[PDB]
Design a protein around this ligand. Sequence first.
Ligand code: NAD
Ligand code: NAD
Ligand code: NAD
Ligand code: NAD
Ligand code: CL
Ligand code: CL
Ligand code: CL
Ligand code: CL
Lengths: 266, 266, 266, 266
Amino acid sequence: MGLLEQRVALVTGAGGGIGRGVARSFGNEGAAVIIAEINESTGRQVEQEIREMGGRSLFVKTDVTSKASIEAAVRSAVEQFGSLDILVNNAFVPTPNVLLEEKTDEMLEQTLTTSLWATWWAMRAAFVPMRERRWGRIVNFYSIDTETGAWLHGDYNTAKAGIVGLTRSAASEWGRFNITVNAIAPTAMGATFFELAAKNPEFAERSAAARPLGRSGDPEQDIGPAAVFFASEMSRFVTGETLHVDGGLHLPGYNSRPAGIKPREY
Amino acid sequence: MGLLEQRVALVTGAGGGIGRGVARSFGNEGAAVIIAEINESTGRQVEQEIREMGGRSLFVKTDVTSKASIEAAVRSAVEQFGSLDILVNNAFVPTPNVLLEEKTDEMLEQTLTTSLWATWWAMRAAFVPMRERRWGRIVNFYSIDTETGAWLHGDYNTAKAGIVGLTRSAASEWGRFNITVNAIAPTAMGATFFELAAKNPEFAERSAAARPLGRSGDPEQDIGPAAVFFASEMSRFVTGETLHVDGGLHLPGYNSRPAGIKPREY
Amino acid sequence: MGLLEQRVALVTGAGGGIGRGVARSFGNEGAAVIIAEINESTGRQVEQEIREMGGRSLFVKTDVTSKASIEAAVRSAVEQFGSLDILVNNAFVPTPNVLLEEKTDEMLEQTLTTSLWATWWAMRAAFVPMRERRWGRIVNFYSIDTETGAWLHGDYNTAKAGIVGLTRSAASEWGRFNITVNAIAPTAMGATFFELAAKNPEFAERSAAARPLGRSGDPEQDIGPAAVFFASEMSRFVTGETLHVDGGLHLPGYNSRPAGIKPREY
Amino acid sequence: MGLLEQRVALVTGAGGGIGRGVARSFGNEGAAVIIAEINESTGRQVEQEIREMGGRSLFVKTDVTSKASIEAAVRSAVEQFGSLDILVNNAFVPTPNVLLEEKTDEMLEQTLTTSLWATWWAMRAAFVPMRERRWGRIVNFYSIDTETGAWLHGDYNTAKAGIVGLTRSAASEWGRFNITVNAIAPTAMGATFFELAAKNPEFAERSAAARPLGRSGDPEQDIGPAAVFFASEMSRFVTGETLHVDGGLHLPGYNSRPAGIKPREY
Ligand SMILES: NC(=O)c1ccc[n+]([C@@H]2O[C@H](COP(=O)([O-])OP(=O)(O)OC[C@H]3O[C@@H](n4cnc5c(N)ncnc54)[C@H](O)[C@@H]3O)[C@@H](O)[C@H]2O)c1
Ligand SMILES: NC(=O)c1ccc[n+]([C@@H]2O[C@H](COP(=O)([O-])OP(=O)(O)OC[C@H]3O[C@@H](n4cnc5c(N)ncnc54)[C@H](O)[C@@H]3O)[C@@H](O)[C@H]2O)c1
Ligand SMILES: NC(=O)c1ccc[n+]([C@@H]2O[C@H](COP(=O)([O-])OP(=O)(O)OC[C@H]3O[C@@H](n4cnc5c(N)ncnc54)[C@H](O)[C@@H]3O)[C@@H](O)[C@H]2O)c1
Ligand SMILES: NC(=O)c1ccc[n+]([C@@H]2O[C@H](COP(=O)([O-])OP(=O)(O)OC[C@H]3O[C@@H](n4cnc5c(N)ncnc54)[C@H](O)[C@@H]3O)[C@@H](O)[C@H]2O)c1
Ligand SMILES: [Cl-]
Ligand SMILES: [Cl-]
Ligand SMILES: [Cl-]
Ligand SMILES: [Cl-]
């Protein structure tokens, strides 16, 4: 049997990258998948892809910077498929890669909204049907950058670290309802990867060689199954955890100092 | 020879609790201490305490929810004493201790403002004189609650987790200017401690027994010297770290489930 | 399809407890399971249980305190079933629960042998067939006690912490052969649990209530699937990780100070 | 007033490298320093340097692979200076830098003896006078390699990870006597550094540039003061902690794959 049969999942930002890989992976395991995506073109594409592969899916245009929009997508999951068993908080909006003192307050506010507030709003909305059914899986996304303090990502590192604190808090409190809450730090060939690869011909080589498994991540084949684990009965005794799904990159780390910045100015 | 001679420090929320203990410890090590405190009465009391003990201090009324007020306090430090070598981000405002699904968006916004934004604004303001002088020490405060996901503190846990991500980011980037950035997770007999002790006669004894060193922390004698370490040349090769200053409490943890909550409702 | 079809697993100490639960889980996912167990009676029992459920299994008497016995068990897996794709280092022997200064050198030697050396020897023996096929999954077991410094377990805590260092080293180096290496910190109802439950009639209910999910772990249903994840293609991009499979216990921790010990003696 | 006045410290392997830097730092803070070192020439050199600088010192020929030799040095500290308040377990013996599958059992046994057993024996011997006086500081040394799984160091990574488990165990239990136990992960220009620098002309510059503070560590000026912190009243409320003293290297990590090893062979 598929690992997610008779379950309903909502994946934010599922039109592309890791969210698309997770949504397709979920569809192949029997889940009804809500594609909660702001891009109507790519959201409907993934909806149709899951259906063509024999799965159940529904695109709901969703802007995770709006609490009302998130609540409406959660209501659609429950109304159209009968439950919302699985929540994946994946959507991401980049800010310019600039040094910390060059980041603006507007960048930090935008990143807090699209990462942290989006996760807060979706978790609290999904909590209601999960609590009623005494079964839930919440899969949040953070980043290895929160642990390395990666250069140029100061606002992102701050918001995604906040997501870890929220993950642990909900895991602690909501386990009494058989709702588990965990966070994945993935790396994969998503939109950022292809942007970096287009600008630097040696980027992909160095990125693959940077990690113990010596290769870059595929969203569906490499990240998908880890989300399935955390969305299924297989992780029924796991809550409050962080897991790196990154080819082992978390072991060596990576030095992200930009080329034009001297290591020592004192 | 005091460990902070000829250095200037700004401590937010230094009118009481841990901030007061840190400020007094800094004064005894020869630093000029700006008491960046919103409560005029307690802020002036600590300024005078440091002076009466032979140190240098200046109370500067500061509201860390206002970027302009923080920036004005940083200018006051440089104008009055010639530099701002050391920044301690300590100020705290509580929200109601309620279950995560009962926290309001307003509570999370307030906690993000008083903890995370306050730290962000003060770090970037203090960065300007620190960069120019190629010497800086930033000491942020987070909490063991971010690691246990402590019940009833979901907003606090989220914001203080963000502080850790911000600490690592600035440590990574600003080391090129000999600015170090570290975070302390303290426990001590502050305002929260005495409130809890007043409602529960056995609280203080159980709190001391909960940890390996078997006693409760004194702000000035137990937290103060850890702050002095991270504000001095002793920590000149330490950056991006988290240190628990808690009698060892981080080892056993603590179970924070409220008495009236059934551990299993499924 | 079963998640481990056409794969061969060797589980040390699989005659009882978590090892038995993992071996039965593996058999139900299509793996041929070598029961590498020192107790012939329980080892054969588990072999026969897996066969009666429609799986493939072979009991091989193995003493993990002997390098030659481990090497022979690895040869038995390859000779009988054609490969050795999955290694689970689970076997355990207790030492007396005594204060750290009362542990003997002999106790530390014994625990280093049964935990650390057993894992070292088995990993290096299994490496040969895994490298040959460029596919391997190694699952090591450590303990939350290594992170809390649990009282009375000082030798165990030391050896199991060593396991984490060895896990990360092999993950770092052997990823180039598509061998992944991860460690689980489980809690479940094994031999120790039932010993404690027999000596204390309220132990089970207190142990279940100590964690966010509010229930004790079943070896097969709660730990089994986490081992399956780390033994399968689902974890193909995960290596060098530690995962707590414990109902969330790692969040609150637990205070293990014995009842008769005064918390403060100074 | 020195931070270690009227205290007595025993530093293993204090004839050179970090041990020598810590011993000299301790002497300048007023401690009587026992140089527990196997090299008579360098041990006596460091003894004379501390005495020439106005400090108190005694070289005791000590081989940390021998429990009796460790016990004799502890007895000499108590007899000759009246106490043994501070223990620093620093000694190190290298094994060949070879791939994990090429390490021998003899190498793991040797590293377990010189790192782990030496620490176990010295901790339990120093415990006796520390407990009697209800005051103790134990400073153990582990390594960032335990966290990155650094290539070619598999035996060292395993033993030093064990040190962390032992550190947490003793912190948990021995705090009741006001004995704290902490572990530092340092990097500095010790014997290994100068060997690497001599074999590669660009090693030192690249090693300095690999970390946020952009410079390599000096044993006395950079590591010494962190050991003083953990050996003094300043850390009286800190126990069971790990602290990186490495210029921030723990943030980016480092990729230790050897030049001639393929990142991917599958
Ligand atoms: N790709 C990596 O290597 C990597 C590394 C670390 C962390 N992550 C994290 O994994 C998750 C996915 O990363 P990715 O690389 O696949 O991203 P991506 O850029 O490839 O896709 C992001 C998706 O989110 C959609 N989206 C943007 N704004 C939205 C909004 N308001 N509302 C709803 N949807 C919106 C986008 O249209 C897009 O489909 C993110 O949380 C990311 O931070 C990824
Ligand atoms: N005391 C503990 O056990 C403990 C535990 C974990 C974390 N912490 C953290 O340590 C730090 C201090 O804790 P505490 O218990 O001593 O707090 P406290 O409540 O005793 O003191 C807080 C100080 O902050 C001042 N303040 C409040 N709002 C302010 C504002 N806008 N602007 C300027 N000043 C303001 C207050 O007037 C007060 O003087 C906090 O960051 C706290 O989160 C403390
Ligand atoms: N059960 C828990 O809560 C828990 C908690 C933390 C860690 N662990 C770890 O999980 C693993 C299993 O724990 P468990 O509680 O199921 O143990 P258990 O005591 O129930 O089973 C141990 C098995 O190991 C076998 N064995 C003993 N010595 C052996 C030897 N030389 N050679 C081969 N087999 C031998 C035993 O005969 C037995 O079948 C262990 O590594 C343990 O340290 C368990
Ligand atoms: N230097 C670094 O960058 C670094 C990095 C990570 C960890 N460490 C750790 O810090 C500590 C010191 O490192 P280092 O580079 O200064 O080492 P080092 O090689 O420079 O000095 C080692 C000292 O130990 C002495 N010694 C060797 N065997 C001994 C024995 N049986 N008994 C007593 N003394 C003995 C040596 O004679 C020497 O004086 C070690 O524990 C090391 O693992 C250092
Ligand atoms: Cl990748
Ligand atoms: Cl306290
Ligand atoms: Cl359990
Ligand atoms: Cl260095």
